Design an enzyme around this catalytic site. Sequence first.
Site, PDB file in Angstrom:
ATOM      1  N   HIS A  91       0.804  -1.226   0.000  1.00 38.69           N
ATOM      2  CA  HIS A  91       0.000   0.000   0.000  1.00 38.69           C
ATOM      3  C   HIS A  91       0.837   1.277   0.000  1.00 38.69           C
ATOM      4  O   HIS A  91       0.339   2.354  -0.334  1.00 38.69           O
ATOM      5  CB  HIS A  91      -0.984   0.007   1.187  1.00 38.69           C
ATOM      6  CG  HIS A  91      -0.399   0.489   2.482  1.00 38.69           C
ATOM      7  ND1 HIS A  91      -0.199  -0.344   3.563  1.00 38.69           N
ATOM      8  CD2 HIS A  91      -0.035   1.727   2.893  1.00 38.69           C
ATOM      9  CE1 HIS A  91       0.257   0.360   4.583  1.00 38.69           C
ATOM     10  NE2 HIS A  91       0.366   1.621   4.203  1.00 38.69           N
ATOM     11  N   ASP A  98      -0.769  -7.282   1.820  1.00 38.35           N
ATOM     12  CA  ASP A  98      -0.097  -5.994   1.891  1.00 38.35           C
ATOM     13  C   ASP A  98       1.414  -6.164   2.020  1.00 38.35           C
ATOM     14  O   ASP A  98       1.988  -5.991   3.099  1.00 38.35           O
ATOM     15  CB  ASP A  98      -0.636  -5.190   3.077  1.00 38.35           C
ATOM     16  CG  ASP A  98      -0.259  -3.729   2.997  1.00 38.35           C
ATOM     17  OD1 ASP A  98       0.299  -3.316   1.957  1.00 38.35           O
ATOM     18  OD2 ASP A  98      -0.522  -2.994   3.967  1.00 38.35           O
ATOM     19  N   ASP A 109       1.248   1.171  20.051  1.00 33.02           N
ATOM     20  CA  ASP A 109       0.870   0.691  18.721  1.00 33.02           C
ATOM     21  C   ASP A 109       1.894   1.245  17.735  1.00 33.02           C
ATOM     22  O   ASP A 109       2.608   2.194  18.049  1.00 33.02           O
ATOM     23  CB  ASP A 109      -0.533   1.209  18.371  1.00 33.02           C
ATOM     24  CG  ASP A 109      -1.156   0.507  17.163  1.00 33.02           C
ATOM     25  OD1 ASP A 109      -0.549  -0.431  16.603  1.00 33.02           O
ATOM     26  OD2 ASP A 109      -2.277   0.904  16.771  1.00 33.02           O
ATOM     27  N   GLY A 163       2.570   6.069   9.565  1.00 30.14           N
ATOM     28  CA  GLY A 163       3.882   6.408   9.041  1.00 30.14           C
ATOM     29  C   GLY A 163       4.930   5.319   9.227  1.00 30.14           C
ATOM     30  O   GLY A 163       6.015   5.391   8.647  1.00 30.14           O
ATOM     31  N   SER A 182       4.161   2.254   8.396  1.00 28.74           N
ATOM     32  CA  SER A 182       3.763   1.289   7.375  1.00 28.74           C
ATOM     33  C   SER A 182       4.966   0.759   6.611  1.00 28.74           C
ATOM     34  O   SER A 182       5.844   1.525   6.212  1.00 28.74           O
ATOM     35  CB  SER A 182       2.792   1.937   6.380  1.00 28.74           C
ATOM     36  OG  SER A 182       1.523   2.178   6.968  1.00 28.74           O
ATOM     37  N   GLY A 183       4.991  -0.553   6.398  1.00 28.00           N
ATOM     38  CA  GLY A 183       6.076  -1.167   5.653  1.00 28.00           C
ATOM     39  C   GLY A 183       7.246  -1.634   6.506  1.00 28.00           C
ATOM     40  O   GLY A 183       8.043  -2.470   6.071  1.00 28.00           O
TER      41      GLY A 183
END
Lengths: 254, 55
Positions: free
Chosen positions: A41, A90, A186, A190, A192-193
């Site tokens: 994504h 993803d 959590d 930002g 992500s990946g």
Amino acid sequence: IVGGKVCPKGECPWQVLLLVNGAQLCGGTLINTIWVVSAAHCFDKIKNWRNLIAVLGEHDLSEHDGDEQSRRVAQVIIPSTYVPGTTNHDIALLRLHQPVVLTDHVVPLCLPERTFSERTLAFVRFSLVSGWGQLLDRGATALELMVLNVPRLMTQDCLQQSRKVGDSPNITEYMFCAGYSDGSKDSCKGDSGGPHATHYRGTWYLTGIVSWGQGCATVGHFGVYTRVSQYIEWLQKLMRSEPRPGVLLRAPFP
Amino acid sequence: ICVNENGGCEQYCSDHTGTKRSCRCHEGYSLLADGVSCTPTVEYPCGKIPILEKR
Ligand SMILES: COc1cc([C@@H]2Nc3ccc(C(=N)N)cc3[C@H]3c4ccccc4C[C@H]32)c(-c2ccc(C(=O)O)cc2)cc1O
Ligand SMILES: [Ca+2]
């Protein structure tokens, strides 16, 4: 990363920073000298693929200390089953234009075999997630790389422990939940990946990718991570293949 | 055998016919004579953190 701490410089040596036109886009994970694993994504909205850069050995975004190594991303490979704008599958595999040089500050995370990951790693309770993402939901992003220890849940348990919101994406066999439902800790958008990394008998392995969730550190909700073990064979086959013209490649999955 | 405590292997485990089991290691590691332990063969093996290892 919400509710974690600064990763001491050099202790997250496989962390990748992805930039587009110089601006931070996403995290990623180095798994050998030329390949990086990130989230599919992250690339939904990219138009100029030639301005995509991976930085290894990064720690503090405000300074250059000489341990940073930047490489152009030559190819982004995404599963055919991934649909832009959705959650399933993803994952992306990135080939760097030139290998990074391994150093004290640049080291690959081990991509595990599938059986080892499913039978053993999947039952290690706690793993580390990291990135330069938001320090708070709707807050500023971090200047220093942050890291957080999160517990993994069985998916049945996740769905039972989570508040119901409606319209919420299903949690498929290609995902797993990890984190806390009390609103304290959590990963965030930002991040992500970036890596969800699991320690076993002295060595760290890639088990997850920061993927999605309801807001960041939202009461009643857990972070959701791409279940990397489902993709080991897919990744290994691609890493043995020759490069093809054009940055984006959709590759069949399985 | 591999399903129980990873067959005793430090890293990877393969089952064979009968009570036979072979441990293996990631690239950049070699298996020791105990048949279970993996030791680095390169300067920067995957999954190891140099500044902590060197302490
Ligand atoms: C799974 O696919 C996707 C997942 C995400 C994005 N990724 C992530 C990643 C991790 C977590 C987590 N709590 N562990 C939450 C989110 C989700 C989140 C938190 C806060 C606001 C919006 C979102 C959507 C979503 C985005 C996304 C990423 C960044 C931004 C932005 O910078 O404004 C907007 C949307 C796009 C996708 O396509
Ligand atoms: Ca820096």
